[PDB]
PDB file of C-alpha atoms and ligand atoms in Angstrom:
ATOM      1  CA  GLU S   2      89.334 132.471  78.528  1.00 18.32           C
ATOM      2  CA  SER S   3      89.387 128.695  78.062  1.00 17.96           C
ATOM      3  CA  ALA S   4      85.708 128.580  77.024  1.00 20.81           C
ATOM      4  CA  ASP S   5      85.981 131.216  74.244  1.00 24.57           C
ATOM      5  CA  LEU S   6      89.044 129.513  72.710  1.00 26.66           C
ATOM      6  CA  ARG S   7      87.219 126.155  72.585  1.00 26.10           C
ATOM      7  CA  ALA S   8      84.320 127.752  70.661  1.00 28.21           C
ATOM      8  CA  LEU S   9      86.800 129.122  68.088  1.00 29.48           C
ATOM      9  CA  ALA S  10      88.203 125.620  67.507  1.00 30.70           C
ATOM     10  CA  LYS S  11      84.653 124.325  66.926  1.00 31.69           C
ATOM     11  CA  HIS S  12      83.904 127.211  64.562  1.00 30.09           C
ATOM     12  CA  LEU S  13      86.940 126.473  62.446  1.00 31.87           C
ATOM     13  CA  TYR S  14      86.310 122.718  62.295  1.00 28.85           C
ATOM     14  CA  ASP S  15      82.725 123.255  61.140  1.00 30.22           C
ATOM     15  CA  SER S  16      83.876 125.678  58.451  1.00 28.67           C
ATOM     16  CA  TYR S  17      86.534 123.162  57.485  1.00 27.64           C
ATOM     17  CA  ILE S  18      83.976 120.409  57.026  1.00 30.69           C
ATOM     18  CA  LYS S  19      81.876 122.773  54.925  1.00 30.72           C
ATOM     19  CA  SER S  20      84.749 123.946  52.757  1.00 30.83           C
ATOM     20  CA  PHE S  21      86.714 120.778  52.093  1.00 28.40           C
ATOM     21  CA  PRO S  22      84.844 117.804  50.602  1.00 30.59           C
ATOM     22  CA  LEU S  23      87.561 115.164  51.072  1.00 34.42           C
ATOM     23  CA  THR S  24      88.693 115.293  54.716  1.00 35.09           C
ATOM     24  CA  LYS S  25      91.545 113.375  56.324  1.00 32.43           C
ATOM     25  CA  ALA S  26      89.014 111.152  58.111  1.00 33.62           C
ATOM     26  CA  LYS S  27      87.475 110.125  54.780  1.00 35.70           C
ATOM     27  CA  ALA S  28      90.876 109.827  53.079  1.00 37.30           C
ATOM     28  CA  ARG S  29      92.264 107.617  55.853  1.00 35.91           C
ATOM     29  CA  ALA S  30      89.162 105.453  55.877  1.00 32.90           C
ATOM     30  CA  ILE S  31      89.728 104.865  52.119  1.00 32.92           C
ATOM     31  CA  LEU S  32      93.456 104.295  52.545  1.00 33.20           C
ATOM     32  CA  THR S  33      92.951 101.838  55.412  1.00 33.26           C
ATOM     33  CA  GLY S  34      90.388  99.877  53.376  1.00 34.71           C
ATOM     34  CA  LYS S  35      87.793 100.602  56.091  1.00 34.33           C
ATOM     35  CA  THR S  36      84.957 101.807  53.880  1.00 34.65           C
ATOM     36  CA  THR S  37      81.793 100.528  52.280  1.00 33.88           C
ATOM     37  CA  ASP S  38      83.223 101.833  48.994  1.00 35.65           C
ATOM     38  CA  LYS S  39      85.134  99.699  46.513  1.00 35.28           C
ATOM     39  CA  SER S  40      88.912 100.198  46.491  1.00 36.32           C
ATOM     40  CA  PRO S  41      90.222 103.041  44.257  1.00 35.94           C
ATOM     41  CA  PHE S  42      91.607 102.259  40.848  1.00 32.50           C
ATOM     42  CA  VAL S  43      95.412 101.996  41.239  1.00 32.53           C
ATOM     43  CA  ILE S  44      97.616 103.743  38.659  1.00 33.67           C
ATOM     44  CA  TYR S  45     101.087 102.191  39.042  1.00 30.78           C
ATOM     45  CA  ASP S  46     102.243 102.011  35.401  1.00 30.67           C
ATOM     46  CA  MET S  47     101.489 103.302  31.901  1.00 32.91           C
ATOM     47  CA  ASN S  48      98.831 100.627  31.145  1.00 33.10           C
ATOM     48  CA  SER S  49      96.982 101.151  34.410  1.00 33.98           C
ATOM     49  CA  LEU S  50      97.168 104.872  33.719  1.00 34.97           C
ATOM     50  CA  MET S  51      95.577 104.416  30.299  1.00 34.12           C
ATOM     51  CA  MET S  52      92.624 102.461  31.727  1.00 31.81           C
ATOM     52  CA  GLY S  53      92.306 104.928  34.599  1.00 35.31           C
ATOM     53  CA  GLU S  54      93.021 107.916  32.387  1.00 34.91           C
ATOM     54  CA  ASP S  55      89.338 108.303  31.774  1.00 33.20           C
ATOM     55  CA  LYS S  56      88.730 108.394  35.574  1.00 33.98           C
ATOM     56  CA  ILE S  57      90.922 111.473  35.943  1.00 31.50           C
ATOM     57  CA  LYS S  58      88.738 114.601  35.962  1.00 36.09           C
ATOM     58  CA  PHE S  59      90.417 116.872  33.477  1.00 37.55           C
ATOM     59  CA  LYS S  60      87.912 119.299  31.977  1.00 38.61           C
ATOM     60  CA  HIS S  61      88.982 120.967  28.739  1.00 36.00           C
ATOM     61  CA  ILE S  62      88.354 121.341  24.976  1.00 34.90           C
ATOM     62  CA  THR S  63      89.940 117.945  24.247  1.00 33.69           C
ATOM     63  CA  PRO S  64      90.062 114.846  26.470  1.00 33.72           C
ATOM     64  CA  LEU S  65      93.048 114.528  28.844  1.00 34.62           C
ATOM     65  CA  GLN S  66      94.682 111.789  26.675  1.00 33.70           C
ATOM     66  CA  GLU S  67      94.643 113.882  23.453  1.00 32.29           C
ATOM     67  CA  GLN S  68      95.951 116.916  25.392  1.00 31.91           C
ATOM     68  CA  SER S  69      99.627 115.943  25.098  1.00 34.67           C
ATOM     69  CA  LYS S  70     101.780 113.310  23.442  1.00 35.15           C
ATOM     70  CA  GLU S  71     103.772 113.163  26.665  1.00 35.98           C
ATOM     71  CA  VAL S  72     102.245 111.537  29.723  1.00 36.95           C
ATOM     72  CA  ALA S  73     104.166 113.538  32.341  1.00 34.73           C
ATOM     73  CA  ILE S  74     102.528 116.637  30.866  1.00 35.66           C
ATOM     74  CA  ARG S  75      99.061 115.147  31.238  1.00 33.21           C
ATOM     75  CA  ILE S  76      99.682 114.325  34.908  1.00 33.78           C
ATOM     76  CA  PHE S  77     101.100 117.781  35.369  1.00 37.85           C
ATOM     77  CA  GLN S  78      97.920 119.283  33.912  1.00 37.97           C
ATOM     78  CA  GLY S  79      95.783 117.182  36.212  1.00 38.82           C
ATOM     79  CA  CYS S  80      97.662 118.450  39.268  1.00 37.43           C
ATOM     80  CA  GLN S  81      97.287 122.072  38.131  1.00 36.87           C
ATOM     81  CA  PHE S  82      93.536 121.601  37.633  1.00 36.66           C
ATOM     82  CA  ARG S  83      93.120 120.142  41.111  1.00 36.32           C
ATOM     83  CA  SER S  84      95.213 123.001  42.521  1.00 37.68           C
ATOM     84  CA  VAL S  85      92.871 125.599  40.966  1.00 41.15           C
ATOM     85  CA  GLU S  86      89.917 123.945  42.658  1.00 37.17           C
ATOM     86  CA  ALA S  87      91.933 123.644  45.903  1.00 36.48           C
ATOM     87  CA  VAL S  88      92.598 127.418  45.902  1.00 36.37           C
ATOM     88  CA  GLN S  89      88.831 127.983  45.618  1.00 35.91           C
ATOM     89  CA  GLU S  90      88.115 125.719  48.584  1.00 33.09           C
ATOM     90  CA  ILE S  91      90.889 127.398  50.649  1.00 34.27           C
ATOM     91  CA  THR S  92      89.645 130.943  49.808  1.00 34.27           C
ATOM     92  CA  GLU S  93      86.155 129.884  50.950  1.00 34.15           C
ATOM     93  CA  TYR S  94      87.577 128.547  54.215  1.00 32.14           C
ATOM     94  CA  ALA S  95      89.676 131.745  54.619  1.00 32.27           C
ATOM     95  CA  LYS S  96      86.508 133.830  54.491  1.00 31.79           C
ATOM     96  CA  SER S  97      85.154 131.761  57.402  1.00 32.37           C
ATOM     97  CA  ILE S  98      87.990 132.651  59.810  1.00 33.24           C
ATOM     98  CA  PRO S  99      86.824 135.414  62.181  1.00 32.46           C
ATOM     99  CA  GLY S 100      88.055 138.860  61.227  1.00 36.19           C
ATOM    100  CA  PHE S 101      89.472 137.809  57.877  1.00 33.96           C
ATOM    101  CA  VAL S 102      86.615 139.631  56.070  1.00 32.75           C
ATOM    102  CA  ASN S 103      87.277 142.858  57.961  1.00 37.49           C
ATOM    103  CA  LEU S 104      90.905 143.258  56.827  1.00 39.52           C
ATOM    104  CA  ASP S 105      91.961 145.103  53.720  1.00 39.71           C
ATOM    105  CA  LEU S 106      91.084 143.094  50.629  1.00 41.69           C
ATOM    106  CA  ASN S 107      94.606 143.624  49.183  1.00 40.22           C
ATOM    107  CA  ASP S 108      95.931 142.189  52.441  1.00 42.50           C
ATOM    108  CA  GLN S 109      93.363 139.384  52.060  1.00 39.31           C
ATOM    109  CA  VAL S 110      94.707 138.731  48.546  1.00 41.57           C
ATOM    110  CA  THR S 111      98.338 138.814  49.720  1.00 39.13           C
ATOM    111  CA  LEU S 112      97.670 136.295  52.491  1.00 39.65           C
ATOM    112  CA  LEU S 113      95.910 133.921  50.066  1.00 39.31           C
ATOM    113  CA  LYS S 114      98.673 134.287  47.518  1.00 37.63           C
ATOM    114  CA  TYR S 115     101.366 133.068  49.840  1.00 35.90           C
ATOM    115  CA  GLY S 116      99.186 130.945  52.007  1.00 34.72           C
ATOM    116  CA  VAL S 117      97.590 128.671  49.383  1.00 33.09           C
ATOM    117  CA  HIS S 118     100.599 126.623  48.329  1.00 32.65           C
ATOM    118  CA  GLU S 119     101.505 125.889  51.956  1.00 31.18           C
ATOM    119  CA  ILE S 120      97.936 124.800  52.769  1.00 31.66           C
ATOM    120  CA  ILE S 121      97.720 122.553  49.697  1.00 35.04           C
ATOM    121  CA  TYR S 122     100.835 120.678  50.723  1.00 34.97           C
ATOM    122  CA  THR S 123      99.505 120.304  54.251  1.00 34.38           C
ATOM    123  CA  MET S 124      96.266 118.796  53.078  1.00 35.33           C
ATOM    124  CA  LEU S 125      97.970 116.739  50.353  1.00 35.78           C
ATOM    125  CA  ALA S 126      99.666 114.879  53.169  1.00 34.01           C
ATOM    126  CA  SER S 127      96.174 113.716  54.250  1.00 33.62           C
ATOM    127  CA  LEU S 128      95.835 111.992  50.882  1.00 33.78           C
ATOM    128  CA  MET S 129      99.278 110.377  51.089  1.00 36.02           C
ATOM    129  CA  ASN S 130     100.764 106.974  51.990  1.00 37.25           C
ATOM    130  CA  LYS S 131     104.435 106.226  51.922  1.00 38.35           C
ATOM    131  CA  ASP S 132     103.497 104.440  48.669  1.00 39.30           C
ATOM    132  CA  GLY S 133     101.169 106.848  46.832  1.00 37.21           C
ATOM    133  CA  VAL S 134      98.479 109.525  46.813  1.00 37.10           C
ATOM    134  CA  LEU S 135      94.702 109.478  46.556  1.00 37.71           C
ATOM    135  CA  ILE S 136      93.644 111.366  43.430  1.00 39.62           C
ATOM    136  CA  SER S 137      90.280 112.355  42.012  1.00 38.16           C
ATOM    137  CA  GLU S 138      88.405 112.685  45.298  1.00 38.69           C
ATOM    138  CA  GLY S 139      89.386 109.249  46.408  1.00 39.66           C
ATOM    139  CA  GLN S 140      88.363 107.492  43.220  1.00 39.28           C
ATOM    140  CA  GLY S 141      91.961 106.671  42.293  1.00 37.19           C
ATOM    141  CA  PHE S 142      95.389 106.053  43.817  1.00 38.38           C
ATOM    142  CA  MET S 143      98.630 106.844  41.977  1.00 36.32           C
ATOM    143  CA  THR S 144     101.764 105.212  43.278  1.00 38.74           C
ATOM    144  CA  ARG S 145     104.830 107.115  44.440  1.00 37.36           C
ATOM    145  CA  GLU S 146     107.066 104.837  42.382  1.00 38.11           C
ATOM    146  CA  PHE S 147     105.077 105.542  39.199  1.00 36.81           C
ATOM    147  CA  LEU S 148     105.218 109.303  39.804  1.00 36.89           C
ATOM    148  CA  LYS S 149     108.924 108.859  40.360  1.00 37.63           C
ATOM    149  CA  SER S 150     109.333 107.071  37.023  1.00 39.80           C
ATOM    150  CA  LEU S 151     108.451 110.077  34.886  1.00 39.96           C
ATOM    151  CA  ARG S 152     111.219 111.631  32.803  1.00 38.44           C
ATOM    152  CA  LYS S 153     113.118 114.615  34.155  1.00 39.38           C
ATOM    153  CA  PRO S 154     112.416 117.130  35.521  1.00 39.28           C
ATOM    154  CA  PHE S 155     109.045 115.636  36.275  1.00 39.38           C
ATOM    155  CA  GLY S 156     110.373 112.524  38.026  1.00 37.47           C
ATOM    156  CA  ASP S 157     111.465 114.476  41.090  1.00 35.50           C
ATOM    157  CA  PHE S 158     108.287 116.610  41.029  1.00 33.27           C
ATOM    158  CA  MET S 159     106.174 114.867  43.701  1.00 33.68           C
ATOM    159  CA  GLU S 160     108.940 113.339  45.831  1.00 34.41           C
ATOM    160  CA  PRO S 161     109.533 116.196  48.342  1.00 32.30           C
ATOM    161  CA  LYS S 162     105.790 116.237  48.759  1.00 29.49           C
ATOM    162  CA  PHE S 163     105.911 112.570  49.740  1.00 29.25           C
ATOM    163  CA  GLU S 164     108.930 113.113  52.027  1.00 29.78           C
ATOM    164  CA  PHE S 165     107.126 115.899  53.842  1.00 28.21           C
ATOM    165  CA  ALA S 166     103.928 113.834  54.090  1.00 34.49           C
ATOM    166  CA  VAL S 167     105.633 110.892  55.775  1.00 33.82           C
ATOM    167  CA  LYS S 168     107.080 113.183  58.478  1.00 35.78           C
ATOM    168  CA  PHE S 169     103.919 115.261  58.846  1.00 37.11           C
ATOM    169  CA  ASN S 170     101.609 112.288  59.013  1.00 35.38           C
ATOM    170  CA  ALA S 171     103.769 110.878  61.778  1.00 39.51           C
ATOM    171  CA  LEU S 172     102.327 113.709  63.920  1.00 39.95           C
ATOM    172  CA  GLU S 173      98.923 111.969  63.565  1.00 38.93           C
ATOM    173  CA  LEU S 174      96.928 115.182  63.423  1.00 36.17           C
ATOM    174  CA  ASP S 175      93.176 114.852  63.098  1.00 31.82           C
ATOM    175  CA  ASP S 176      90.831 117.053  61.036  1.00 31.00           C
ATOM    176  CA  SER S 177      89.976 119.324  63.970  1.00 31.77           C
ATOM    177  CA  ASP S 178      93.674 120.011  64.575  1.00 34.07           C
ATOM    178  CA  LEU S 179      94.278 120.715  60.883  1.00 30.06           C
ATOM    179  CA  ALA S 180      91.466 123.242  60.716  1.00 29.06           C
ATOM    180  CA  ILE S 181      93.245 125.462  63.234  1.00 27.23           C
ATOM    181  CA  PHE S 182      96.732 124.814  61.873  1.00 24.49           C
ATOM    182  CA  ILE S 183      95.591 125.848  58.417  1.00 25.70           C
ATOM    183  CA  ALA S 184      93.992 128.994  59.835  1.00 26.11           C
ATOM    184  CA  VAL S 185      97.274 129.867  61.485  1.00 25.76           C
ATOM    185  CA  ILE S 186      99.185 129.490  58.220  1.00 26.64           C
ATOM    186  CA  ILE S 187      96.785 131.786  56.364  1.00 26.39           C
ATOM    187  CA  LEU S 188      97.155 134.518  59.003  1.00 23.62           C
ATOM    188  CA  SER S 189     101.002 134.781  58.786  1.00 25.48           C
ATOM    189  CA  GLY S 190     101.950 138.418  59.331  1.00 24.30           C
ATOM    190  CA  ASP S 191     105.378 138.177  57.583  1.00 26.38           C
ATOM    191  CA  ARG S 192     104.016 137.807  54.052  1.00 25.59           C
ATOM    192  CA  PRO S 193     105.783 140.202  51.663  1.00 25.97           C
ATOM    193  CA  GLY S 194     103.754 143.297  50.799  1.00 23.67           C
ATOM    194  CA  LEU S 195     101.211 143.194  53.607  1.00 22.81           C
ATOM    195  CA  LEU S 196      99.808 146.678  54.221  1.00 22.79           C
ATOM    196  CA  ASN S 197      98.582 146.346  57.858  1.00 23.09           C
ATOM    197  CA  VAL S 198     100.587 143.700  59.725  1.00 23.70           C
ATOM    198  CA  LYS S 199      99.257 144.314  63.224  1.00 26.88           C
ATOM    199  CA  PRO S 200      95.622 143.125  62.849  1.00 30.51           C
ATOM    200  CA  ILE S 201      96.862 139.990  61.075  1.00 31.41           C
ATOM    201  CA  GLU S 202      99.307 139.011  63.810  1.00 36.51           C
ATOM    202  CA  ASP S 203      96.606 139.842  66.389  1.00 34.02           C
ATOM    203  CA  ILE S 204      94.302 137.214  64.900  1.00 35.22           C
ATOM    204  CA  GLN S 205      97.215 134.816  64.393  1.00 33.55           C
ATOM    205  CA  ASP S 206      98.082 135.172  68.086  1.00 33.93           C
ATOM    206  CA  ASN S 207      94.514 134.256  68.958  1.00 33.77           C
ATOM    207  CA  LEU S 208      94.620 131.268  66.550  1.00 34.95           C
ATOM    208  CA  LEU S 209      97.932 130.108  67.981  1.00 34.24           C
ATOM    209  CA  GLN S 210      96.430 129.943  71.480  1.00 32.99           C
ATOM    210  CA  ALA S 211      93.428 128.009  70.310  1.00 30.71           C
ATOM    211  CA  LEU S 212      95.819 125.684  68.534  1.00 30.75           C
ATOM    212  CA  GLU S 213      97.906 124.831  71.543  1.00 30.40           C
ATOM    213  CA  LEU S 214      94.806 124.366  73.670  1.00 30.64           C
ATOM    214  CA  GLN S 215      93.418 122.102  70.947  1.00 29.39           C
ATOM    215  CA  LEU S 216      96.601 120.080  70.840  1.00 27.61           C
ATOM    216  CA  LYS S 217      96.850 119.664  74.621  1.00 24.69           C
ATOM    217  CA  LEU S 218      93.249 118.472  74.891  1.00 23.95           C
ATOM    218  CA  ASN S 219      93.099 116.306  71.736  1.00 24.50           C
ATOM    219  CA  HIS S 220      96.712 115.013  72.084  1.00 26.11           C
ATOM    220  CA  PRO S 221      97.618 115.003  75.821  1.00 26.14           C
ATOM    221  CA  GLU S 222     100.308 112.275  75.615  1.00 26.21           C
ATOM    222  CA  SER S 223     102.131 113.982  72.695  1.00 22.26           C
ATOM    223  CA  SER S 224     104.827 116.118  74.270  1.00 22.94           C
ATOM    224  CA  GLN S 225     105.828 119.316  72.465  1.00 21.89           C
ATOM    225  CA  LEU S 226     103.382 118.662  69.629  1.00 18.38           C
ATOM    226  CA  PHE S 227     102.711 122.381  69.270  1.00 16.33           C
ATOM    227  CA  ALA S 228     106.488 122.878  68.900  1.00 15.89           C
ATOM    228  CA  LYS S 229     106.818 120.176  66.249  1.00 16.70           C
ATOM    229  CA  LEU S 230     103.915 121.579  64.295  1.00 16.75           C
ATOM    230  CA  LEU S 231     105.310 125.133  64.118  1.00 19.55           C
ATOM    231  CA  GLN S 232     108.568 123.700  62.822  1.00 20.45           C
ATOM    232  CA  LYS S 233     106.612 122.073  60.043  1.00 21.56           C
ATOM    233  CA  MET S 234     105.298 125.501  59.020  1.00 21.13           C
ATOM    234  CA  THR S 235     108.846 126.465  58.219  1.00 20.42           C
ATOM    235  CA  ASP S 236     109.405 123.198  56.321  1.00 21.41           C
ATOM    236  CA  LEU S 237     106.364 124.021  54.121  1.00 18.57           C
ATOM    237  CA  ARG S 238     107.913 127.401  53.161  1.00 18.83           C
ATOM    238  CA  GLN S 239     110.886 125.405  51.945  1.00 20.21           C
ATOM    239  CA  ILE S 240     108.823 122.946  49.889  1.00 22.82           C
ATOM    240  CA  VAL S 241     107.081 125.737  48.077  1.00 22.08           C
ATOM    241  CA  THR S 242     110.439 127.325  47.333  1.00 20.99           C
ATOM    242  CA  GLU S 243     111.666 124.072  45.818  1.00 22.29           C
ATOM    243  CA  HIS S 244     108.467 123.754  43.857  1.00 20.13           C
ATOM    244  CA  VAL S 245     108.722 127.242  42.345  1.00 17.68           C
ATOM    245  CA  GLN S 246     112.262 126.625  41.186  1.00 17.45           C
ATOM    246  CA  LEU S 247     111.055 123.511  39.414  1.00 20.48           C
ATOM    247  CA  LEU S 248     108.257 125.387  37.716  1.00 23.38           C
ATOM    248  CA  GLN S 249     110.738 127.948  36.349  1.00 21.58           C
ATOM    249  CA  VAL S 250     112.933 125.156  35.012  1.00 22.89           C
ATOM    250  CA  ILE S 251     109.814 123.832  33.296  1.00 24.09           C
ATOM    251  CA  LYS S 252     108.830 127.365  32.153  1.00 20.96           C
ATOM    252  CA  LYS S 253     112.042 127.964  30.161  1.00 18.16           C
ATOM    253  CA  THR S 254     112.589 124.217  29.530  1.00 19.75           C
ATOM    254  CA  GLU S 255     109.104 123.334  28.188  1.00 19.33           C
ATOM    255  CA  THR S 256     107.318 125.321  25.513  1.00 18.01           C
ATOM    256  CA  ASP S 257     104.162 123.191  25.733  1.00 14.31           C
ATOM    257  CA  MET S 258     103.359 123.736  29.470  1.00 12.50           C
ATOM    258  CA  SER S 259     100.447 126.174  29.940  1.00 15.07           C
ATOM    259  CA  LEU S 260      99.489 127.784  33.268  1.00 16.23           C
ATOM    260  CA  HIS S 261      95.985 128.671  34.437  1.00 18.58           C
ATOM    261  CA  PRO S 262      95.451 132.407  35.012  1.00 21.83           C
ATOM    262  CA  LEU S 263      94.635 131.965  38.688  1.00 18.68           C
ATOM    263  CA  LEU S 264      97.856 130.090  39.326  1.00 17.82           C
ATOM    264  CA  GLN S 265      99.638 132.556  37.119  1.00 16.80           C
ATOM    265  CA  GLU S 266      98.525 135.391  39.448  1.00 13.82           C
ATOM    266  CA  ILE S 267      99.844 133.552  42.529  1.00 10.86           C
ATOM    267  CA  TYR S 268     103.136 132.657  40.827  1.00 12.01           C
ATOM    268  CA  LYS S 269     103.939 136.128  39.436  1.00 12.55           C
ATOM    269  CA  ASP S 270     106.112 138.303  41.690  1.00 12.89           C
ATOM    270  CA  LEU S 271     106.626 135.512  44.228  1.00 13.90           C
TER     271      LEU S 271
ATOM    272  CA  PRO U   4      91.431 142.416  37.951  1.00 14.59           C
ATOM    273  CA  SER U   5      92.691 139.882  40.463  1.00 15.71           C
ATOM    274  CA  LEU U   6      91.042 136.497  40.100  1.00 13.62           C
ATOM    275  CA  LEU U   7      91.619 135.942  43.831  1.00 11.83           C
ATOM    276  CA  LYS U   8      89.879 139.193  44.526  1.00 12.01           C
ATOM    277  CA  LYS U   9      86.974 138.010  42.344  1.00 10.25           C
ATOM    278  CA  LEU U  10      86.798 134.803  44.371  1.00 10.57           C
ATOM    279  CA  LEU U  11      86.876 136.816  47.588  1.00 11.33           C
ATOM    280  CA  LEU U  12      83.963 139.084  46.620  1.00  8.57           C
ATOM    281  CA  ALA U  13      81.979 135.984  45.627  1.00 11.35           C
ATOM    282  CA  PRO U  14      78.989 134.990  47.787  1.00 10.22           C
TER     283      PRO U  14
HETATM  284  O1  SJ9 N 301     102.106 120.541  43.566  1.00  8.92           O
HETATM  285  C1  SJ9 N 301     100.903 120.597  43.433  1.00  8.92           C
HETATM  286  N1  SJ9 N 301     100.206 121.805  42.996  1.00  8.92           N
HETATM  287  C2  SJ9 N 301     100.965 122.934  42.469  1.00  8.92           C
HETATM  288  C3  SJ9 N 301     101.015 122.910  40.951  1.00  8.92           C
HETATM  289  C4  SJ9 N 301     100.908 124.096  40.245  1.00  8.92           C
HETATM  290  C5  SJ9 N 301     100.945 124.077  38.851  1.00  8.92           C
HETATM  291  C6  SJ9 N 301     101.091 122.884  38.155  1.00  8.92           C
HETATM  292  C7  SJ9 N 301     101.201 121.704  38.881  1.00  8.92           C
HETATM  293  C8  SJ9 N 301     101.165 121.710  40.269  1.00  8.92           C
HETATM  294  C9  SJ9 N 301     100.037 119.368  43.610  1.00  8.92           C
HETATM  295  C10 SJ9 N 301     100.549 118.114  43.282  1.00  8.92           C
HETATM  296  C11 SJ9 N 301      99.712 116.990  43.392  1.00  8.92           C
HETATM  297  C12 SJ9 N 301      98.355 117.143  43.792  1.00  8.92           C
HETATM  298  C13 SJ9 N 301      97.834 118.393  44.079  1.00  8.92           C
HETATM  299  C14 SJ9 N 301      98.686 119.529  43.992  1.00  8.92           C
HETATM  300  C15 SJ9 N 301      96.456 118.182  44.448  1.00  8.92           C
HETATM  301  C16 SJ9 N 301      96.253 116.810  44.320  1.00  8.92           C
HETATM  302  C17 SJ9 N 301      94.960 116.084  44.596  1.00  8.92           C
HETATM  303  O2  SJ9 N 301      93.968 116.714  45.341  1.00  8.92           O
HETATM  304  O3  SJ9 N 301      94.760 114.988  44.184  1.00  8.92           O
HETATM  305  N2  SJ9 N 301      97.389 116.243  43.960  1.00  8.92           N
HETATM  306  C18 SJ9 N 301      97.586 114.820  43.766  1.00  8.92           C
HETATM  307  C19 SJ9 N 301      97.508 114.392  42.326  1.00  8.92           C
HETATM  308  C20 SJ9 N 301      98.431 113.453  41.868  1.00  8.92           C
HETATM  309  C21 SJ9 N 301      98.419 113.022  40.574  1.00  8.92           C
HETATM  310  C22 SJ9 N 301      97.456 113.552  39.732  1.00  8.92           C
HETATM  311 CL1  SJ9 N 301      97.383 113.016  38.092  1.00  8.92          CL
HETATM  312  C23 SJ9 N 301      96.559 114.483  40.159  1.00  8.92           C
HETATM  313  F1  SJ9 N 301      95.682 114.954  39.300  1.00  8.92           F
HETATM  314  C24 SJ9 N 301      96.568 114.924  41.462  1.00  8.92           C
END
């Protein structure tokens, strides 16, 4: 049984490389300054943001800068745009996981709907230092302090993401580990409204074995790593909860904020 | 029409 589980881990890691353009390996290389490439443009303040504002990939009728008078809104829009693309990359990876295609589509939609936010925050940690986050596919770096400067409620918007990333990065997971971990999160059988729970948990049980084999082999000296990682899964639930509350406060609080239809689908009835 | 469903039935 050991040989079949190892093949699954390989399958997932290959799909992961195919699906996700900026990997942890690449992100860490950039963050550690070990790269042929020139260092990212650092946005730490309003002036740096203005010069680097053009670098941000916001695609719309008007340029990012003209989009709002208020800078926290423009950053918010950039995050939402990246999230829409992130959901596409996750969905593509979800289709790669064995048996996911066979399940009921409505189940497949339910799993993505709850899964995506938790996966995004996992992979965001790959982009994160204690001091900031790589943005725009590595081309820029926005500091944690600058994100924390923005007026309320936006100032506290990214901070739990940073707090989670410090703890999660301390696990020192590599890309191969993450591929399986992510697969496990997608295949959670306790999502509200799932029609057929049994096939889901069946796959998730298989994924969980591959994961702990992966972690023993890849991280032999790390005692109870599997345990620590499962506990994180529960932490992610709690980040998303926090995040949704904040969106509602924005919803009623800000008239200007506009939500993409894809996000809007995931957010409704959550 | 779910947009997620549309993404799922994509190639
Ligand atoms: O909570 C996030 N999504 C949920 C969400 C949903 C509705 C509106 C806003 C939020 C989130 C936050 C930050 C994120 C990403 C996702 C993905 C990236 C990424 O891949 O870079 N980042 C970093 C980042 C930081 C600053 C700028 Cl300006 C930016 F464009 C991107």
